[PDB]
Structures are given as C-alpha cells and as structure tokens.
Amino acid sequence: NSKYEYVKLFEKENYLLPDTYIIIRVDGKGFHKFSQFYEFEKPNDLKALQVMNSAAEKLMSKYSDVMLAYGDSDEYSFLLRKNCQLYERREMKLTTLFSSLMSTYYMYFWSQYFPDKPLHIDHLPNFDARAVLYPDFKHIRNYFSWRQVDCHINNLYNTTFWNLVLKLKMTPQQAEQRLMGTVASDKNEILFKECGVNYNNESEMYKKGTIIVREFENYAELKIYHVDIINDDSWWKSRPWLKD
Amino acid sequence: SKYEYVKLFEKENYLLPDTYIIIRVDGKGFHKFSQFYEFEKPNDLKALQVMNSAAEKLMSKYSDVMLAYGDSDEYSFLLRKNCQLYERREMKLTTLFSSLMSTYYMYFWSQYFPDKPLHIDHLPNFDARAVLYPDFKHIRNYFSWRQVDCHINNLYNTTFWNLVLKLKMTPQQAEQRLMGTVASDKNEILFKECGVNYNNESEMYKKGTIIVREFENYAELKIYHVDIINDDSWWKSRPWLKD
Amino acid sequence: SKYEYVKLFEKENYLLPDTYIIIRVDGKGFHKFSQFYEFEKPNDLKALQVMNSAAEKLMSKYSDVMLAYGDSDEYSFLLRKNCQLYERREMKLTTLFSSLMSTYYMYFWSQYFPDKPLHIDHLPNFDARAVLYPDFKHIRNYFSWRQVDCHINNLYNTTFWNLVLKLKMTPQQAEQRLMGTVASDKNEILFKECGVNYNNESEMYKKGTIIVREFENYETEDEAELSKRQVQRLEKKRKKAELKIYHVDIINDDSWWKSRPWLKD
Amino acid sequence: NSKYEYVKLFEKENYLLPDTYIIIRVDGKGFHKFSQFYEFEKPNDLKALQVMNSAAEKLMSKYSDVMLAYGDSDEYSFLLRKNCQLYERREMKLTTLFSSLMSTYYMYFWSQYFPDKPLHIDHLPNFDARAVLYPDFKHIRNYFSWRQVDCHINNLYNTTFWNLVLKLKMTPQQAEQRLMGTVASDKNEILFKECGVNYNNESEMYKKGTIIVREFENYETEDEAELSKRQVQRLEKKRKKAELKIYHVDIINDDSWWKSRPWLKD
C-alpha cells in the first residue's frame, strides 16, 4: 500500500521560468525515410505540407496561449505568450503533449488527404518536441528569422537538387556533386538555364514556409500567411499582442 | 549567421548514467475519451487490449525496454540502466514515447473498434515522464507501487459503479458510502451489499498487464496478468531485468 | 585513464542567457551567532559595518555586480543581464559568492572586533542562491520585497528588544505581547510605553543599505557592432567607477531608478 | 510584502536524486597565485596541507553524513552516505555550505599554523564546491581512485619540476621544456640520475594524499525502512561519536581496505 509510494519522491519536475516567452519546436522523426516510404513528391509534397498545416492550426486552436506558429518541411515552432500558465509551465507536460498532439493530428489528417496511402505500423509519423525559453521579444524575432532563413536555404537547395535529378535525369549522387561549392546565385542559374525553372515563381509556401498567427481586432481568429517575417518590421508592429 | 545564436538558449537534460530509467505514459483526458467512445464501465476490455497492443509494439521496437506494466490509461516502461537511446536525453526519450504510444494507439484502435471511427476532437494523446532509480530494489518497489495502485483504483471504480448499478444509488450516495473505507472494506461492500464477488473479476482488471522480455540461455515478449508484488521468485529468475 | 569517466556524472547548470541574475547570501544561524558574540540589540552597528564592508569589497572586485542591497545577515547582488562571469555557471557563481562573503566577513570581523576573536564552532557561514529575472520590473519588485522585509523585521525587532531592555520583559513574554499586533500598534508600544520614536532610528536600520555602481557620462552606447578597444574602455570605466552607499527608499522613488539607466543595461 | 513576494516564485531548487551517493568536491580558487604570495614551500608545503586537513576533519566531525574524505593539493572530496537528508538534499544548500565551511575553517586554522603571515584581503582562501551523484558504489571507488592517480601525476610533475629549478638552477621555461613529453618513468629517472632524489623517499602524504575515514568497531550492515523513530537516532549517535582516522595509503588497488569498511557503502 503506502509502503511503496516513496518511489514518487524520485520524480523531478521542471517548472519553466515565469514571465518568459516559450518556443516549442516539433520536428518529424526520420521524415527522410517516411517521405520515401510514402512516395512524397519531390522537392515538395503539397498535400504532405497541408497535413502539417492542418495539424498545427488545430493544435493552435486548442490552446489560446499559442500566439504564433511557423512551419516548413517536417517542423513547426509554436510561440506561447510569456504569461502562459498552461500545465503550470511544466516542461514535461508542455513538450510530451505537443509531440503527442502533432503526432495524432498528423495521423488524422493524413487519412483525410491520403486515403489511398494507409499508414503502415512500422512507418507511423512521430515527432520530438523541445521547449526553449527566450527572455526578450528580440530573440523571438530572431528565432523565427532563423527558421525562415533555414526554409530558404533548404528549399533552394532541394528544388535545385530534385530538378537536376528529375529533369536532367541525374541520380541523387551526381546531383550532390554538381551542387558542392555552388552559392545561391549559382543554384538559381542552374534552375533557370538547365532545368527551365524560374525559382522566384515557386509557390510562396515552399519558399517562405507557413505562418499561422492569432489576429485581434479591438486590442480571436486564426489566419494563415506565406510571407517574409525577417525584414518586414511593420508585420510585427501591427501585431503587438504577439509580444504581450 | 546572425540569427543562429538563438540555438544557445536550448538546455538539454542528460539523465544520470548507469541508472534505471522508468518512462510512464498516461492518457490525456481519458475520462472524456472513454465517455465519447462509450467505453464499458468500470473496465473496458477492448480499450485495454488497444493499450496492450500499443505497448507490446513499442517494446518490440526498442530492445532497451526490459519490462512494461499497464493498467487503466497508463503504461510504465523500464529501460535497462546502461541504455544509450538518444544519449539519454530526457527531452528525446519522453517526447518519443508519448508520440509512439499515441500513434500506436490510433493504429490499433482502428483494428479493435472499426465501428467507432476516431473524431478529430477526441484523439488518443499521452503525456510521458522519465524517472531515475539508482538501485533495482526501487524498481521492484516502483512496479509494486503501480500494481497496488491498480488494485486500489480497480476496487474503487468497481465498487462505485456497482453501488450505482446494483443498489441504484446516486453518484453522491455511492461516494458517501465509500468515504473512509479501506480496500478490505470495499471488497466486503461489493460482496455483502452489491452482490458482486470481486475475486471473480478478470485477472487483467485486478492485476493489470505485464509485458516482459524473456531470455532462455542467459527474444520473446510474453504478457502476464499475475502478482509481481510478493512473488520474489518471479523477479529472481529474471536477472536480465537488473542487467 | 581508466578512472576519468566519473567526470561524466557532473551536471552543470548554465543560467539562461540575457537575463538578470540575483545572488542572495544569507548568514547561517546568525540568531545563535549574534547571541554568542553578544551583538547589541536590536541592531549591532559594527556587525552591519562588517557586512557592508564585505559586500562593498566583493562588488569592487566584480564589475558585473551593478547593485547590492543588504540588511540584517543578508545581501543581494544584481549581476548585469549580459554577465559572462564563469560562463554563467550556477555552481561557480553561487559557491564563489558564499565563499567570498564568508571570508570577507571573517577578515572584516577581525578588523572591527579585535577584542572578540572568532571561535571555531561559531564561524560566519553563508548560503547563496542564484535567481533569474527576465524583466527589469521584476528586479525593482525584488528589491522592494527585500526593503519591505527590512522594514517589517526592524520594526518588530526594535519593539521586541525595547520591551525587553527598557520594560524588563523576558523574551518569551515580549513575544506574546507582540502576537497579533500590527504596525501602528508596534509604533504605539515604542512611543507611549518605551519613549522611543521609531522614525528617529538610523536610516540604515530602517531602510537597509544600497551599494550602487555610479556612472557619470553614461549613454546606452552598447550594441553588437561596436567592439574591440571601445568595449575595453566600457569595461575599464565599469571597474573604476565609484560605489556609493545609500540608506533611502527604493520602493516608491522611481526617479532614483530612472536616473540610473545603466542598472537595466 | 504581499505585492512583492511573488518574486520568490522564480527560484528553482535542485533536489538531488534520493538514495544515491553524493560527492562534494571543493577546490581552492587561484591557489597557484595564493601559494606564491604566502611563499608556500615547493613542491609541497607541509603546513599548508595541514591547514586543509584540519579544515576537512573539523567539517567532517561536524557533519555525520560525511563518511569519507580525500584531499591533496588545494582540493578535498567528501563522500555523503546514500540516505543523507542534510538540507533535504538541496544542491544549492549542500554546495554553498561546503564552500563556505571550508573557506572559514581554512582561515581559522591558517591563523593557528601561520601566526606571522596574516591573511590579506586580496588573498583570502576561497573555494568552489560541486555536488556529483553516483548511483553505484563501484563509481565511488573509481572516483577516489581518479583523485589519487591525479595526486600522483601532479606530485611527480611538481617534484621533478621544482628539483630541476631549485637544485639544477634551471629557469622555469627550460624546466618546463625539459618535462614536455616525459612520462612518469622518465620523471622518476630525471629525479634519480640528475637530481640525486629518490621519488619514493618523498613523504607518503605528498605522494598519496590524505584519506579521512569514519571508523566503526561493532558494525553490522542492516539499513532499512522498518527501523525508525528513536532506533534511527542511536545509529545517528553512533555515527556522530565515531572516530576519524587519517591515512596516507593506496586506495586505488587495495580492495581489502574497502571490503573491511562496509559502512562506506550504506
């Protein structure tokens, strides 16, 4: 009975520092293999991104403390307002519930968008999740800038890579050697001149990723954007509730 | 890069080496979940079969899991003390387990309840926590703790719902009858007042579920519904749980 | 080496970057300690001067310390938010501060109380804890918290010991006399029964002690681009600026904080 | 008061995992410079080590949870029994108390051993202190082995270095360049063949360090949840009033030394 419950004293809770912005980032586990197994289109599978986006928006609509979400590829980052008391700011609760939620929402929406690709039990969509604290909103701006810069680099690379492979019939291995050394202008030239692709004409979602933001009128409703957030300061300034 | 410094704000937790790790998952809002999908009360057999299939599948994927114990909407997994899965990072281990149990549950649900398709607002989610134990006797006491808790809670729920269904008590009147009572009292209340013999309840409901890796010439996963609190020989004949 | 793996069991705690750090040290068993060396009651001036000398000395050695507040057997130190002392290691920051205050206290004690050599079973020990605050408004409220506490404990102790020393009550009956009492009552007890006006007590006893780094020609001149020899000059001025001591209200006087912008930066 | 006390909620305590061995290691801050300022004898200053040993033994006689201590140079490691509840196993409390205790005990004993070299305010003996958890006693064995091997390595280097400088009248740079590359056996010969010094003739304390142990005579091992209340208190009494013995011996390779002291494991 009560002779075993002392083992409860070995648990250690981690209460995240109060009045600090929390970022929760989730990223698909082994999604390179996952995207091969389910034959994702390359470089970008549109419906696969729409599954991520439905999952993230659904989560965000469940927790009014999530003010802003940014996603691309197999990742999503969620901004929690600094006065968030969700699960008393317990790190274990916030992170394992977020990876659990994204996982199950992903499975739900996958069966909707891909009815002909039923999930195999050895290839279920799993996510990790980590919480990071940022004490000042300038780090929050820089964080999302970090994630959008990364979206740019990876999409430009992948779009070039997969066009070398699919249009020029290169194998993945010869595509990589072709790109070693190349800078951004080079990849652009290769896409236009060799593959007949104008990179600037790629979908805004592929190039910029996806922003889900909570909108307030008399400072709520969820709106989705595919825009620059790195250099457009007015985008943030007209949204002061992201900071409060 | 001018933005990547933000990575330096991340803080990892590497769990103390050479210590046993328990990962415990527990269903999020499973009161509501069990009502929405019209689970049988006090215990739903097929729901438990879904948990057990999920846990067995996870365990068959991760050779570091030596033992699992489940009852109700929870499961505990023992990782061997020299486990190096994700370099023993707490963030990785716990979010992987909550993600794994969640999706395995969704997968197995559709096998066991083809007639109860999952609703977008009622998916099976789990939390997950890691606990360190520096000595195997604490691992023994840990699984004893969970099994005793299975007993206490199964007794409570079985008694409560039979007071309501057999004696036609209201929820408050049943709660009022149970105030103060200890386990032997609840067992007696069931027999004498509700006409239910608790000892005849299913062993799974009473004892919970143990999944253990069996080695012969010290592998196979075997499922048990047996006492592990007082049977020292059950543990003693399985030294690989310690090692 | 076959034994050095044991180093891997150590766990460092690097305090979150860009946040204010408060270190609070507090004397271990200073009730018993102040009895053993027969401190004057309610306040021993020279014992407080020993604490203030220790804190001023520590602060003169570590330019990241921007502000210190003390009373009784405690001192709190504000580290600027971009402090990199020991790479923000919690273990290093706290045990250094408890060690420093302990040794500075023993040194200054032998200067101020040459006739009371310290006994080996009653050495002055301090704990020390680091606390993070993500916004400067929390730093203001933190120091308000400590100054409100200084007021409360000093009003109680002054009433208590005047009941004992002037009215010849035993400690326990003085304690019972004060059970239930609120602030105006303690004030009345002191005035009407003991002939002491609490408002006439020393500012140091009532308000505590503030040690602040003072800068003269300060502009928030710091940004990531400016570097090299400019930064060394900013660092040099922080070392060779003057520590001023105050016994003033810092709870409600915003202009005191407002005219000292380098505390936030 | 009530509107400001919320700031208390930002504090984060670290409760060290129950029932695991705790090692607290303290090491003197900047004792290289400290040893030069007060003109420590080189390679080893006997009275300086005696100040450390007195400090450690006094601490150890004050805290019955400390079962074993090992010191050499400017460091000491203290072993806490597994069931130690000193300050509820709070890491902030355990560590800042130890760095504080060692610092003040050192200052105290220094004035006993060095009455003519009073401590200067810019050269006080300060210590850091860290707590480390070890879940199995074999790691405790290896920890103290680790520290004694380190003691051997540093004493041998320092003995060779200072004999080259002080006897052979070498400059610091060449003594240092002379030792680059050398292993223990090389150092042993430079001392013997070139300095006429037999390293084994050095004091055992310098070579082996200092072990301080709590000794029990009529010890039987039983430690359990069942025994409680005042029963725990006599075991506390036995532990508080037990003898501290000092040794300067190998503990790396001597299994019988440990096996005959089973109370260290509890």
Ligand SMILES: Nc1ncnc2c1ncn2[C@@H]1O[C@H](COP(=O)(O)OP(=O)(O)OP(=O)(O)O)[C@@H](O)[C@H]1O
């Ligand atoms: N402080 C405690 N002391 C002893 N037992 C506890 C304590 N808190 C919870 N328990 C028990 O431990 C078991 C594990 O459940 P769990 O830890 O999820 O409790 P909970 O209240 O849901 O807490 P959490 O918020 O951590 O999920 C429960 O049966 C519960 O009764």
Ligand SMILES: Nc1ncnc2c1ncn2[C@@H]1O[C@H](COP(=O)(O)OP(=O)(O)OP(=O)(O)O)[C@@H](O)[C@H]1O
């Ligand atoms: N919508 C998509 N369309 C096409 N490919 C995708 C899509 N989403 C993900 N991928 C593939 O999944 C990969 C995710 O890369 P990531 O850096 O997360 O590695 P990972 O395989 O998920 O490994 P990890 O377990 O370390 O996260 C991408 O490189 C791409 O190969």
Ligand SMILES: Nc1ncnc2c1ncn2[C@@H]1O[C@H](COP(=O)(O)OP(=O)(O)OP(=O)(O)O)[C@@H](O)[C@H]1O
């Ligand atoms: N040490 C680092 N410094 C800067 N950026 C990094 C570092 N490690 C990873 N990144 C980048 O951070 C982004 C987030 O990836 P993530 O945090 O999942 O890292 P990872 O390398 O997969 O490690 P893990 O998932 O094991 O923590 C990725 O774009 C990755 O390229």
Ligand SMILES: Nc1ncnc2c1ncn2[C@@H]1O[C@H](COP(=O)(O)OP(=O)(O)OP(=O)(O)O)[C@@H](O)[C@H]1O
């Ligand atoms: N197999 C099952 N049959 C019947 N009921 C079940 C079953 N599994 C779970 N439940 C119901 O779900 C509840 C889960 O209890 P728990 O204390 O975990 O509450 P919860 O709603 O899941 O809250 P939390 O989110 O804090 O875990 C049980 O008390 C029971 O009512």
Ligand SMILES: Nc1ncnc2c1ncn2[C@@H]1O[C@H](COP(=O)(O)OP(=O)(O)OP(=O)(O)O)[C@@H](O)[C@H]1O
């Ligand atoms: N990364 C490491 N790996 C193995 N041994 C180390 C390492 N760092 C230090 N040591 C050794 O550990 C012993 C204890 O020294 P200590 O723990 O004080 O570390 P340190 O290097 O002084 O750094 P700090 O005191 O800042 O943690 C010393 O003998 C040192 O040589």
Ligand SMILES: Nc1ncnc2c1ncn2[C@@H]1O[C@H](COP(=O)(O)OP(=O)(O)OP(=O)(O)O)[C@@H](O)[C@H]1O
């Ligand atoms: N300058 C002084 N004059 C007279 N007495 C003092 C002075 N400074 C400290 N004291 C005594 O020391 C006490 C310090 O109180 P505190 O609340 O820190 O308790 P403590 O005995 O130090 O216990 P702890 O170990 O929890 O800090 C005061 O109550 C006061 O009696």
Ligand SMILES: Nc1ncnc2c1ncn2[C@@H]1O[C@H](COP(=O)(O)OP(=O)(O)OP(=O)(O)O)[C@@H](O)[C@H]1O
């Ligand atoms: N839980 C609490 N909430 C608010 N104030 C507290 C709390 N505990 C202590 N305090 C107050 O905080 C001030 C600082 O004292 P300190 O931080 O040393 O705490 P303590 O109660 O002595 O416990 P410890 O020093 O062991 O952490 C004192 O005024 C004390 O009365």
Ligand SMILES: Nc1ncnc2c1ncn2[C@@H]1O[C@H](COP(=O)(O)OP(=O)(O)OP(=O)(O)O)[C@@H](O)[C@H]1O
């Ligand atoms: N008893 C002693 N006799 C002679 N020299 C000593 C003695 N104790 C300490 N020292 C000197 O103090 C030094 C302590 O070495 P340690 O590695 O701790 O460096 P430190 O200068 O104290 O730096 P840190 O602050 O990182 O500890 C030794 O190298 C030696 O020079």
Ligand SMILES: [Mg+2]
């Ligand atoms: Mg990753």
Ligand SMILES: [Mg+2]
């Ligand atoms: Mg991934």
Ligand SMILES: [Mg+2]
């Ligand atoms: Mg990714």
Ligand SMILES: [Mg+2]
């Ligand atoms: Mg729970």
Ligand SMILES: [Mg+2]
């Ligand atoms: Mg649950």
Ligand SMILES: [Mg+2]
């Ligand atoms: Mg539960």
Ligand SMILES: [Mg+2]
């Ligand atoms: Mg205290």
Ligand SMILES: [Mg+2]
């Ligand atoms: Mg005190």
